[PDB]
């Protein structure tokens, strides 16, 4: 096909782009300056055991065989795992991240998934983060100006999200135990978890990416919806957001409830949903402004002690805001596209953006899972009743 040629052109640019981004915003030279620098500055040494931990991983691709998806379980759950099933299938019926889902029946008669991650992936990933922490230490000693603060904790933190299952395995169960018998959200119970293998409830849906494709108007409305509303109620129901979502993570069943079945990406928000948001996009369509940059400059939302244009601020908030101002929105790939176009033309006026670059971390979590969400919201070219569940979940967004 042309098609997929386009996607893989579109994921190699955005790939570029986000390198540049990395020389221009981060290692303070270009990718491959960089490269020779850290060949110089790393013992030639470190090559080959770098390369042999990849290699155990690159053994045995994907699927892995039943006997040694039997050696991850013996040393998961001990030799005698076949006890904790009533069957095991050894014919694997997905693939995950590192790892392939086999379908089983617990001993207590239970459908479920059981994850198993691949022998080779623990070694592979903590390898390649050695790799990273080394080539981290080369930029921070010898790329002057580079900024890579934080980077080394988000890396150790990423590989180990990846590589304990048992993490994921807790967020899904603060999920399962919030969101029990819930009328519109299903999250399947976590039966067992170890670090390499987690078992949780089976569940049948229509996946999210199916409807996106061939959905009916009416799947689509109400998978978007649902996926709306989980968005604002988790933080409010147990303090958490689901976070950076994907198409992937979601469901619907027959009952018209939502399955949620990954929670690699559980974001903290003990407070709750910030009111300042629901507040900011009510003052914001009200077009009070002077109540609104107080309010934003406060918040952090934009600059502190800047000029700043209301032009840019509208910009800035309208793919919030348009959506709010109907009782129902249809959430289209055409309107995300027009949301990407600016009002201020630079040859205009060369002005520096009002936009914050370093938002709060309670701002900035929540806002980047909404982006997501909403792109998602717009390939499934769902209509929303996204006004009367902001007035119901968000804080301050309501009349008061």
Request: proline share 13%; net charge positive; no cysteine.
């Given at each position: 096909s042309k098609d997929e040629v386009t996607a893989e052109l579109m994921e190699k640019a955005a790939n570029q782009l986000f390198t540049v981004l990395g020389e221009l915003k981060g290692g303070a030279m270009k990718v491959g300056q960089a490269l020779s620098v850290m060949e110089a500055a790393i013992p030639d040494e470190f090559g080959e055991p770098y390369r042999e931990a990849l290699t155990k991983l690159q053994k045995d691709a994907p699927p892995l065989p039943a006997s040694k998806v039997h050696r991850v379980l013996d040393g998961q759950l001990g030799t005698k795992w076949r006890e904790r099933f009533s069957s095991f299938n050894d014919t694997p019926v997905a693939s995950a991240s590192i790892g392939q889902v086999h379908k089983a029946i617990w001993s207590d008669g239970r459908?479920?998934?059981?994850?198993?991650?691949?022998?080779?992936?623990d070694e592979a990933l903590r390898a390649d983060l050695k790799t990273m922490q080394r080539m981290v230490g080369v930029l921070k000693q010898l790329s002057p100006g580079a900024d890579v603060q934080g980077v080394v904790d988000e890396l150790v933190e990423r590989t180990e999200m990846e590589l304990d299952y048992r993490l994921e395995a807790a967020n899904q169960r603060a999920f399962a135990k919030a969101y029990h018998?819930?009328?519109?959200?299903?999250?399947?119970?976590?039966?067992?978890?170890?670090?390499?293998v987690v078992i949780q409830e089976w569940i049948e849906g229509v996946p999210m990416a199916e409807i996106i494709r061939h959905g009916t108007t009416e799947q689509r409305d109400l998978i978007g919806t649902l996926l709306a509303e989980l968005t604002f109620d988790a933080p409010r129901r147990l303090g958490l957001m689901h976070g950076d979502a994907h198409?992937?993570?979601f469901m619907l069943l027959?009952?018209?409830?939502?399955?949620?079945?990954?929670?690699g990406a559980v974001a903290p928000m003990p407070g709750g949903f910030p009111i300042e948001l629901?507040?900011?996009?009510?003052?914001a369509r009200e077009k009070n402004y002077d109540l609104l940059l107080p309010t934003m400059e406060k918040a952090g939302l934009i600059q502190r002690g800047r000029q700043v244009s209301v032009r840019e601020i509208d910009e800035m908030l309208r793919q919030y805001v348009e959506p709010i101002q109907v009782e129902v929105f249809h959430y289209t790939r055409k309107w995300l596209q027009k949301m990407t176009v600016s009002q201020i033309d630079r040859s205009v006026a060369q002005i520096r953006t009002a936009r914050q670059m370093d938002l709060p971390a309670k701002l900035a979590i929540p806002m980047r899972v909404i982006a997501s969400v909403g792109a998602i919201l717009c390939q499934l070219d769902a209509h929303v009743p996204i006004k009367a569940l902001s007035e119901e979940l968000i804080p301050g967004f309501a009349e008061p």
């Open positions: 459908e479920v998934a059981v994850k198993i991650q691949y022998p080779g992936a018998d819930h009328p519109r959200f299903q999250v399947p119970h976590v039966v067992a978890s170890a670090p390499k198409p992937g993570n027959p009952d018209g409830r939502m399955g949620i079945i990954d929670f629901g507040m900011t996009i009510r003052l």
